[PDB]
mmJSON file of the N, C-alpha and C atoms, coordinates in Angstrom:
{"data_MODEL":{"atom_site":{
"group_PDB":["ATOM","ATOM","ATOM","ATOM","ATOM","ATOM","ATOM","ATOM","ATOM","ATOM","ATOM","ATOM","ATOM","ATOM","ATOM","ATOM","ATOM","ATOM","ATOM","ATOM","ATOM","ATOM","ATOM","ATOM","ATOM","ATOM","ATOM","ATOM","ATOM","ATOM","ATOM","ATOM","ATOM","ATOM","ATOM","ATOM","ATOM","ATOM","ATOM","ATOM","ATOM","ATOM","ATOM","ATOM","ATOM","ATOM","ATOM","ATOM","ATOM","ATOM","ATOM","ATOM","ATOM","ATOM","ATOM","ATOM","ATOM","ATOM","ATOM","ATOM","ATOM","ATOM","ATOM","ATOM","ATOM","ATOM","ATOM","ATOM","ATOM","ATOM","ATOM","ATOM","ATOM","ATOM","ATOM","ATOM","ATOM","ATOM","ATOM","ATOM","ATOM","ATOM","ATOM","ATOM","ATOM","ATOM","ATOM","ATOM","ATOM","ATOM","ATOM","ATOM","ATOM","ATOM","ATOM","ATOM","ATOM","ATOM","ATOM","ATOM","ATOM","ATOM","ATOM","ATOM","ATOM","ATOM","ATOM","ATOM","ATOM","ATOM","ATOM","ATOM","ATOM","ATOM","ATOM","ATOM","ATOM","ATOM","ATOM","ATOM","ATOM","ATOM","ATOM","ATOM","ATOM","ATOM","ATOM","ATOM","ATOM","ATOM","ATOM","ATOM","ATOM","ATOM","ATOM","ATOM","ATOM","ATOM","ATOM","ATOM","ATOM","ATOM","ATOM","ATOM","ATOM","ATOM","ATOM","ATOM","ATOM","ATOM","ATOM","ATOM","ATOM","ATOM","ATOM","ATOM","ATOM","ATOM","ATOM","ATOM","ATOM","ATOM","ATOM","ATOM","ATOM","ATOM","ATOM","ATOM","ATOM","ATOM","ATOM","ATOM","ATOM","ATOM","ATOM","ATOM","ATOM","ATOM","ATOM","ATOM"],
"id":[1,2,3,4,5,6,7,8,9,10,11,12,13,14,15,16,17,18,19,20,21,22,23,24,25,26,27,28,29,30,31,32,33,34,35,36,37,38,39,40,41,42,43,44,45,46,47,48,49,50,51,52,53,54,55,56,57,58,59,60,61,62,63,64,65,66,67,68,69,70,71,72,73,74,75,76,77,78,79,80,81,82,83,84,85,86,87,88,89,90,91,92,93,94,95,96,97,98,99,100,101,102,103,104,105,106,107,108,109,110,111,112,113,114,115,116,117,118,119,120,121,122,123,124,125,126,127,128,129,130,131,132,133,134,135,136,137,138,139,140,141,142,143,144,145,146,147,148,149,150,151,152,153,154,155,156,157,158,159,160,161,162,163,164,165,166,167,168,169,170,171,172,173,174,175,176,177,178,179,180],
"type_symbol":["N","C","C","N","C","C","N","C","C","N","C","C","N","C","C","N","C","C","N","C","C","N","C","C","N","C","C","N","C","C","N","C","C","N","C","C","N","C","C","N","C","C","N","C","C","N","C","C","N","C","C","N","C","C","N","C","C","N","C","C","N","C","C","N","C","C","N","C","C","N","C","C","N","C","C","N","C","C","N","C","C","N","C","C","N","C","C","N","C","C","N","C","C","N","C","C","N","C","C","N","C","C","N","C","C","N","C","C","N","C","C","N","C","C","N","C","C","N","C","C","N","C","C","N","C","C","N","C","C","N","C","C","N","C","C","N","C","C","N","C","C","N","C","C","N","C","C","N","C","C","N","C","C","N","C","C","N","C","C","N","C","C","N","C","C","N","C","C","N","C","C","N","C","C","N","C","C","N","C","C"],
"label_atom_id":["N","CA","C","N","CA","C","N","CA","C","N","CA","C","N","CA","C","N","CA","C","N","CA","C","N","CA","C","N","CA","C","N","CA","C","N","CA","C","N","CA","C","N","CA","C","N","CA","C","N","CA","C","N","CA","C","N","CA","C","N","CA","C","N","CA","C","N","CA","C","N","CA","C","N","CA","C","N","CA","C","N","CA","C","N","CA","C","N","CA","C","N","CA","C","N","CA","C","N","CA","C","N","CA","C","N","CA","C","N","CA","C","N","CA","C","N","CA","C","N","CA","C","N","CA","C","N","CA","C","N","CA","C","N","CA","C","N","CA","C","N","CA","C","N","CA","C","N","CA","C","N","CA","C","N","CA","C","N","CA","C","N","CA","C","N","CA","C","N","CA","C","N","CA","C","N","CA","C","N","CA","C","N","CA","C","N","CA","C","N","CA","C","N","CA","C","N","CA","C","N","CA","C","N","CA","C","N","CA","C"],
"label_alt_id":[null,null,null,null,null,null,null,null,null,null,null,null,null,null,null,null,null,null,null,null,null,null,null,null,null,null,null,null,null,null,null,null,null,null,null,null,null,null,null,null,null,null,null,null,null,null,null,null,null,null,null,null,null,null,null,null,null,null,null,null,null,null,null,null,null,null,null,null,null,null,null,null,null,null,null,null,null,null,null,null,null,null,null,null,null,null,null,null,null,null,null,null,null,null,null,null,null,null,null,null,null,null,null,null,null,null,null,null,null,null,null,null,null,null,null,null,null,null,null,null,null,null,null,null,null,null,null,null,null,null,null,null,null,null,null,null,null,null,null,null,null,null,null,null,null,null,null,null,null,null,null,null,null,null,null,null,null,null,null,null,null,null,null,null,null,null,null,null,null,null,null,null,null,null,null,null,null,null,null,null],
"label_comp_id":["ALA","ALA","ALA","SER","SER","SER","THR","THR","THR","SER","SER","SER","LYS","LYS","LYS","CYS","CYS","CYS","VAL","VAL","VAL","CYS","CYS","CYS","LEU","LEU","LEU","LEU","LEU","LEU","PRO","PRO","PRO","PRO","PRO","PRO","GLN","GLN","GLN","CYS","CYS","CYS","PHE","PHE","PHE","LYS","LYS","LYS","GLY","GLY","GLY","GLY","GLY","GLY","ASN","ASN","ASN","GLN","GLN","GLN","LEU","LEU","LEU","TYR","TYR","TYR","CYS","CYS","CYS","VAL","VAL","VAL","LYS","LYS","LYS","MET","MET","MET","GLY","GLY","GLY","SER","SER","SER","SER","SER","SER","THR","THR","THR","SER","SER","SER","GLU","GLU","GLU","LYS","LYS","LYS","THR","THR","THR","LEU","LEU","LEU","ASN","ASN","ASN","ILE","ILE","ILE","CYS","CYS","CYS","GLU","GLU","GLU","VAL","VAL","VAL","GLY","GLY","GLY","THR","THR","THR","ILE","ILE","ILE","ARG","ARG","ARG","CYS","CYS","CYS","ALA","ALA","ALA","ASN","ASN","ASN","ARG","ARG","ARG","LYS","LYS","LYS","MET","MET","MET","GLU","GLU","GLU","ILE","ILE","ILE","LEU","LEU","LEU","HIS","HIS","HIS","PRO","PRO","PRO","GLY","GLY","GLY","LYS","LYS","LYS","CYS","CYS","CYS","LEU","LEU","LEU","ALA","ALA","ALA"],
"label_asym_id":["A","A","A","A","A","A","A","A","A","A","A","A","A","A","A","A","A","A","A","A","A","A","A","A","A","A","A","A","A","A","A","A","A","A","A","A","A","A","A","A","A","A","A","A","A","A","A","A","A","A","A","A","A","A","A","A","A","A","A","A","A","A","A","A","A","A","A","A","A","A","A","A","A","A","A","A","A","A","A","A","A","A","A","A","A","A","A","A","A","A","A","A","A","A","A","A","A","A","A","A","A","A","A","A","A","A","A","A","A","A","A","A","A","A","A","A","A","A","A","A","A","A","A","A","A","A","A","A","A","A","A","A","A","A","A","A","A","A","A","A","A","A","A","A","A","A","A","A","A","A","A","A","A","A","A","A","A","A","A","A","A","A","A","A","A","A","A","A","A","A","A","A","A","A","A","A","A","A","A","A"],
"label_entity_id":["1","1","1","1","1","1","1","1","1","1","1","1","1","1","1","1","1","1","1","1","1","1","1","1","1","1","1","1","1","1","1","1","1","1","1","1","1","1","1","1","1","1","1","1","1","1","1","1","1","1","1","1","1","1","1","1","1","1","1","1","1","1","1","1","1","1","1","1","1","1","1","1","1","1","1","1","1","1","1","1","1","1","1","1","1","1","1","1","1","1","1","1","1","1","1","1","1","1","1","1","1","1","1","1","1","1","1","1","1","1","1","1","1","1","1","1","1","1","1","1","1","1","1","1","1","1","1","1","1","1","1","1","1","1","1","1","1","1","1","1","1","1","1","1","1","1","1","1","1","1","1","1","1","1","1","1","1","1","1","1","1","1","1","1","1","1","1","1","1","1","1","1","1","1","1","1","1","1","1","1"],
"label_seq_id":[1,1,1,2,2,2,3,3,3,4,4,4,5,5,5,6,6,6,7,7,7,8,8,8,9,9,9,10,10,10,11,11,11,12,12,12,13,13,13,14,14,14,15,15,15,16,16,16,17,17,17,18,18,18,19,19,19,20,20,20,21,21,21,22,22,22,23,23,23,24,24,24,25,25,25,26,26,26,27,27,27,28,28,28,29,29,29,30,30,30,31,31,31,32,32,32,33,33,33,34,34,34,35,35,35,36,36,36,37,37,37,38,38,38,39,39,39,40,40,40,41,41,41,42,42,42,43,43,43,44,44,44,45,45,45,46,46,46,47,47,47,48,48,48,49,49,49,50,50,50,51,51,51,52,52,52,53,53,53,54,54,54,55,55,55,56,56,56,57,57,57,58,58,58,59,59,59,60,60,60],
"pdbx_PDB_ins_code":[null,null,null,null,null,null,null,null,null,null,null,null,null,null,null,null,null,null,null,null,null,null,null,null,null,null,null,null,null,null,null,null,null,null,null,null,null,null,null,null,null,null,null,null,null,null,null,null,null,null,null,null,null,null,null,null,null,null,null,null,null,null,null,null,null,null,null,null,null,null,null,null,null,null,null,null,null,null,null,null,null,null,null,null,null,null,null,null,null,null,null,null,null,null,null,null,null,null,null,null,null,null,null,null,null,null,null,null,null,null,null,null,null,null,null,null,null,null,null,null,null,null,null,null,null,null,null,null,null,null,null,null,null,null,null,null,null,null,null,null,null,null,null,null,null,null,null,null,null,null,null,null,null,null,null,null,null,null,null,null,null,null,null,null,null,null,null,null,null,null,null,null,null,null,null,null,null,null,null,null],
"Cartn_x":[0.706,0.013,0.854,2.177,3.162,2.797,3.132,4.037,5.43,5.693,6.875,7.206,6.46,6.699,5.478,5.608,4.541,3.243,2.706,3.392,2.62,3.631,3.129,2.208,2.262,1.414,0.339,-0.785,-1.855,-1.44,-1.551,-1.295,-1.942,-3.239,-3.846,-2.897,-2.381,-1.414,-0.069,0.162,1.219,0.958,-0.144,-0.885,-0.352,-0.21,0.371,1.841,2.544,3.93,4.147,3.238,3.013,4.405,4.82,6.041,7.319,7.579,8.624,9.62,9.086,9.799,10.676,12.084,13.003,12.796,12.969,13.034,11.889,10.865,9.695,9.429,8.919,8.403,7.835,7.145,6.617,5.671,6.007,5.104,4.895,3.963,3.627,3.016,3.039,2.547,1.202,1.349,0.333,0.26,1.248,0.965,1.539,2.834,3.384,2.955,3.061,2.594,3.75,3.779,4.682,4.125,4.944,4.652,5.414,5.296,6.269,7.011,8.248,8.993,8.392,7.268,6.544,6.025,5.521,4.963,6.008,7.22,8.48,8.418,8.672,8.673,7.363,6.291,4.872,4.704,5.073,4.98,5.738,7.035,7.879,7.472,6.596,6.14,5.271,4.617,3.74,4.722,5.884,7.016,6.421,6.851,6.538,6.824,5.921,6.151,7.356,7.956,9.104,9.541,10.461,10.752,10.866,11.791,11.941,12.35,11.808,12.099,13.494,14.437,15.559,15.467,14.536,14.508,13.965,13.302,12.824,13.935,14.808,14.778,14.383,15.543,15.408,16.143,15.386,14.006,13.827,14.535,14.572,13.603],
"Cartn_y":[-1.178,-0.006,1.249,1.107,2.229,3.121,4.585,5.255,5.25,4.878,4.74,3.437,3.093,2.023,1.105,-0.091,-1.159,-0.878,0.047,0.617,0.431,0.15,-0.047,-1.091,-2.115,-3.495,-3.386,-3.855,-3.775,-4.827,-4.229,-4.982,-6.367,-6.455,-8.045,-8.949,-8.459,-9.289,-9.685,-9.127,-9.48,-10.726,-11.135,-12.154,-13.452,-13.482,-14.499,-14.688,-13.652,-13.417,-14.276,-15.154,-16.05,-16.829,-17.056,-17.873,-17.3,-16.11,-15.534,-14.955,-14.866,-14.635,-13.276,-13.34,-12.416,-11.142,-9.923,-8.968,-8.016,-8.212,-7.343,-7.066,-5.788,-5.45,-4.092,-3.644,-2.398,-1.922,-0.447,0.18,1.673,2.234,3.711,3.574,4.799,4.733,3.89,3.238,2.081,1.135,0.175,-0.904,-2.46,-2.552,-3.567,-5.131,-5.091,-6.429,-7.038,-8.485,-9.318,-9.543,-9.546,-9.476,-10.197,-9.931,-10.401,-9.545,-9.596,-8.58,-8.036,-8.597,-7.995,-6.492,-6.336,-5.11,-3.992,-4.375,-3.66,-2.528,-2.891,-2.024,-1.227,-1.887,-1.208,-0.021,-0.129,0.847,1.979,1.579,2.528,3.69,3.057,4.13,5.154,5.011,6.048,6.565,6.065,6.313,5.971,6.942,7.063,5.752,5.05,3.833,3.386,2.05,1.587,1.451,2.011,2.045,0.696,-0.295,-1.521,-1.691,-2.41,-2.374,-3.171,-2.434,-3.038,-4.459,-4.419,-5.879,-7.037,-6.814,-8.068,-9.023,-8.555,-7.457,-8.147,-8.725,-9.61,-10.867,-11.879,-12.326,-12.232,-13.155,-13.243,-14.483],
"Cartn_z":[-0.012,0.016,-0.026,0.165,0.202,1.263,1.317,0.278,0.877,2.065,2.735,3.507,4.521,5.181,5.3,5.859,5.914,5.94,7.012,7.978,9.425,10.42,11.682,11.99,11.917,11.962,12.969,12.802,13.895,15.06,16.321,17.507,17.597,16.979,17.19,16.335,15.468,14.376,15.237,16.243,17.134,18.071,18.163,18.87,18.143,16.776,16.134,16.321,17.028,17.439,18.737,19.144,20.504,20.45,21.725,21.956,21.538,21.096,20.482,21.637,22.961,24.024,23.954,24.051,23.98,25.106,24.777,25.879,25.786,26.789,26.999,28.587,28.914,30.119,30.141,31.278,31.424,30.499,30.171,28.929,29.539,28.865,29.382,30.708,31.45,32.902,33.153,34.012,34.51,33.555,33.301,32.496,33.03,33.151,33.839,33.201,31.939,31.346,30.495,30.548,29.768,28.413,27.516,25.974,25.044,23.754,22.655,22.023,21.483,20.794,19.685,19.231,17.914,18.392,19.459,19.771,20.083,20.43,20.664,19.511,18.356,17.097,16.908,17.206,16.985,18.096,19.302,20.345,20.082,19.437,19.2,18.172,17.24,16.049,16.799,17.727,18.647,19.784,19.848,20.977,22.262,23.203,24.539,25.05,26.055,26.695,27.147,26.896,27.138,28.718,29.064,30.44,31.21,30.642,31.086,32.51,33.313,34.676,35.06,35.771,35.934,36.94,37.97,38.634,37.983,36.739,35.958,35.399,34.586,33.622,32.417,31.881,30.878,31.326,31.534,31.302,29.733,28.947,27.703,27.246],
"occupancy":[1.0,1.0,1.0,1.0,1.0,1.0,1.0,1.0,1.0,1.0,1.0,1.0,1.0,1.0,1.0,1.0,1.0,1.0,1.0,1.0,1.0,1.0,1.0,1.0,1.0,1.0,1.0,1.0,1.0,1.0,1.0,1.0,1.0,1.0,1.0,1.0,1.0,1.0,1.0,1.0,1.0,1.0,1.0,1.0,1.0,1.0,1.0,1.0,1.0,1.0,1.0,1.0,1.0,1.0,1.0,1.0,1.0,1.0,1.0,1.0,1.0,1.0,1.0,1.0,1.0,1.0,1.0,1.0,1.0,1.0,1.0,1.0,1.0,1.0,1.0,1.0,1.0,1.0,1.0,1.0,1.0,1.0,1.0,1.0,1.0,1.0,1.0,1.0,1.0,1.0,1.0,1.0,1.0,1.0,1.0,1.0,1.0,1.0,1.0,1.0,1.0,1.0,1.0,1.0,1.0,1.0,1.0,1.0,1.0,1.0,1.0,1.0,1.0,1.0,1.0,1.0,1.0,1.0,1.0,1.0,1.0,1.0,1.0,1.0,1.0,1.0,1.0,1.0,1.0,1.0,1.0,1.0,1.0,1.0,1.0,1.0,1.0,1.0,1.0,1.0,1.0,1.0,1.0,1.0,1.0,1.0,1.0,1.0,1.0,1.0,1.0,1.0,1.0,1.0,1.0,1.0,1.0,1.0,1.0,1.0,1.0,1.0,1.0,1.0,1.0,1.0,1.0,1.0,1.0,1.0,1.0,1.0,1.0,1.0,1.0,1.0,1.0,1.0,1.0,1.0],
"B_iso_or_equiv":[0.0,0.0,0.0,0.0,0.0,0.0,0.0,0.0,0.0,0.0,0.0,0.0,0.0,0.0,0.0,0.0,0.0,0.0,0.0,0.0,0.0,0.0,0.0,0.0,0.0,0.0,0.0,0.0,0.0,0.0,0.0,0.0,0.0,0.0,0.0,0.0,0.0,0.0,0.0,0.0,0.0,0.0,0.0,0.0,0.0,0.0,0.0,0.0,0.0,0.0,0.0,0.0,0.0,0.0,0.0,0.0,0.0,0.0,0.0,0.0,0.0,0.0,0.0,0.0,0.0,0.0,0.0,0.0,0.0,0.0,0.0,0.0,0.0,0.0,0.0,0.0,0.0,0.0,0.0,0.0,0.0,0.0,0.0,0.0,0.0,0.0,0.0,0.0,0.0,0.0,0.0,0.0,0.0,0.0,0.0,0.0,0.0,0.0,0.0,0.0,0.0,0.0,0.0,0.0,0.0,0.0,0.0,0.0,0.0,0.0,0.0,0.0,0.0,0.0,0.0,0.0,0.0,0.0,0.0,0.0,0.0,0.0,0.0,0.0,0.0,0.0,0.0,0.0,0.0,0.0,0.0,0.0,0.0,0.0,0.0,0.0,0.0,0.0,0.0,0.0,0.0,0.0,0.0,0.0,0.0,0.0,0.0,0.0,0.0,0.0,0.0,0.0,0.0,0.0,0.0,0.0,0.0,0.0,0.0,0.0,0.0,0.0,0.0,0.0,0.0,0.0,0.0,0.0,0.0,0.0,0.0,0.0,0.0,0.0,0.0,0.0,0.0,0.0,0.0,0.0],
"pdbx_formal_charge":[null,null,null,null,null,null,null,null,null,null,null,null,null,null,null,null,null,null,null,null,null,null,null,null,null,null,null,null,null,null,null,null,null,null,null,null,null,null,null,null,null,null,null,null,null,null,null,null,null,null,null,null,null,null,null,null,null,null,null,null,null,null,null,null,null,null,null,null,null,null,null,null,null,null,null,null,null,null,null,null,null,null,null,null,null,null,null,null,null,null,null,null,null,null,null,null,null,null,null,null,null,null,null,null,null,null,null,null,null,null,null,null,null,null,null,null,null,null,null,null,null,null,null,null,null,null,null,null,null,null,null,null,null,null,null,null,null,null,null,null,null,null,null,null,null,null,null,null,null,null,null,null,null,null,null,null,null,null,null,null,null,null,null,null,null,null,null,null,null,null,null,null,null,null,null,null,null,null,null,null],
"auth_seq_id":[1,1,1,2,2,2,3,3,3,4,4,4,5,5,5,6,6,6,7,7,7,8,8,8,9,9,9,10,10,10,11,11,11,12,12,12,13,13,13,14,14,14,15,15,15,16,16,16,17,17,17,18,18,18,19,19,19,20,20,20,21,21,21,22,22,22,23,23,23,24,24,24,25,25,25,26,26,26,27,27,27,28,28,28,29,29,29,30,30,30,31,31,31,32,32,32,33,33,33,34,34,34,35,35,35,36,36,36,37,37,37,38,38,38,39,39,39,40,40,40,41,41,41,42,42,42,43,43,43,44,44,44,45,45,45,46,46,46,47,47,47,48,48,48,49,49,49,50,50,50,51,51,51,52,52,52,53,53,53,54,54,54,55,55,55,56,56,56,57,57,57,58,58,58,59,59,59,60,60,60],
"auth_comp_id":["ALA","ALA","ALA","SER","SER","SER","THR","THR","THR","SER","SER","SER","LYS","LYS","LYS","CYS","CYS","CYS","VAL","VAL","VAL","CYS","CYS","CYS","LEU","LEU","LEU","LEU","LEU","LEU","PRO","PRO","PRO","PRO","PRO","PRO","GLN","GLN","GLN","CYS","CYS","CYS","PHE","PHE","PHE","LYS","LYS","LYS","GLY","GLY","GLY","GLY","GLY","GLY","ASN","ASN","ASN","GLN","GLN","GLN","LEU","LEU","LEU","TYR","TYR","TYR","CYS","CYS","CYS","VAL","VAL","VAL","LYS","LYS","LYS","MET","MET","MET","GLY","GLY","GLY","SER","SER","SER","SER","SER","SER","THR","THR","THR","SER","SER","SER","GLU","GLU","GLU","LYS","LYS","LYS","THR","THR","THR","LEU","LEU","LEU","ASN","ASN","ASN","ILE","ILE","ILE","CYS","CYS","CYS","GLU","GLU","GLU","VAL","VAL","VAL","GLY","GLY","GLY","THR","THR","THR","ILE","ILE","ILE","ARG","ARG","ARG","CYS","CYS","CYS","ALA","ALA","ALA","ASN","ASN","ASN","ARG","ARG","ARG","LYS","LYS","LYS","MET","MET","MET","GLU","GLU","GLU","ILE","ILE","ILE","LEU","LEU","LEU","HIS","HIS","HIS","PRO","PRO","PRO","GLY","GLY","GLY","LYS","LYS","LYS","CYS","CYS","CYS","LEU","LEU","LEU","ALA","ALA","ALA"],
"auth_asym_id":["A","A","A","A","A","A","A","A","A","A","A","A","A","A","A","A","A","A","A","A","A","A","A","A","A","A","A","A","A","A","A","A","A","A","A","A","A","A","A","A","A","A","A","A","A","A","A","A","A","A","A","A","A","A","A","A","A","A","A","A","A","A","A","A","A","A","A","A","A","A","A","A","A","A","A","A","A","A","A","A","A","A","A","A","A","A","A","A","A","A","A","A","A","A","A","A","A","A","A","A","A","A","A","A","A","A","A","A","A","A","A","A","A","A","A","A","A","A","A","A","A","A","A","A","A","A","A","A","A","A","A","A","A","A","A","A","A","A","A","A","A","A","A","A","A","A","A","A","A","A","A","A","A","A","A","A","A","A","A","A","A","A","A","A","A","A","A","A","A","A","A","A","A","A","A","A","A","A","A","A"],
"auth_atom_id":["N","CA","C","N","CA","C","N","CA","C","N","CA","C","N","CA","C","N","CA","C","N","CA","C","N","CA","C","N","CA","C","N","CA","C","N","CA","C","N","CA","C","N","CA","C","N","CA","C","N","CA","C","N","CA","C","N","CA","C","N","CA","C","N","CA","C","N","CA","C","N","CA","C","N","CA","C","N","CA","C","N","CA","C","N","CA","C","N","CA","C","N","CA","C","N","CA","C","N","CA","C","N","CA","C","N","CA","C","N","CA","C","N","CA","C","N","CA","C","N","CA","C","N","CA","C","N","CA","C","N","CA","C","N","CA","C","N","CA","C","N","CA","C","N","CA","C","N","CA","C","N","CA","C","N","CA","C","N","CA","C","N","CA","C","N","CA","C","N","CA","C","N","CA","C","N","CA","C","N","CA","C","N","CA","C","N","CA","C","N","CA","C","N","CA","C","N","CA","C","N","CA","C","N","CA","C","N","CA","C"],
"pdbx_PDB_model_num":[1,1,1,1,1,1,1,1,1,1,1,1,1,1,1,1,1,1,1,1,1,1,1,1,1,1,1,1,1,1,1,1,1,1,1,1,1,1,1,1,1,1,1,1,1,1,1,1,1,1,1,1,1,1,1,1,1,1,1,1,1,1,1,1,1,1,1,1,1,1,1,1,1,1,1,1,1,1,1,1,1,1,1,1,1,1,1,1,1,1,1,1,1,1,1,1,1,1,1,1,1,1,1,1,1,1,1,1,1,1,1,1,1,1,1,1,1,1,1,1,1,1,1,1,1,1,1,1,1,1,1,1,1,1,1,1,1,1,1,1,1,1,1,1,1,1,1,1,1,1,1,1,1,1,1,1,1,1,1,1,1,1,1,1,1,1,1,1,1,1,1,1,1,1,1,1,1,1,1,1]
}}}
């Protein structure tokens, strides 16, 4: 569909990214949820979030 990128895949499509493990934690204020690395690239499109907790941590 162009004009530049993919662009920024739908979050429900990351559910197909089950058992991919790797590095995930926290998020935007009031989140604290475990996920798949699929969403790491998606959440960065809208930025903010992240802030991986040091005590977890990876947890790969």
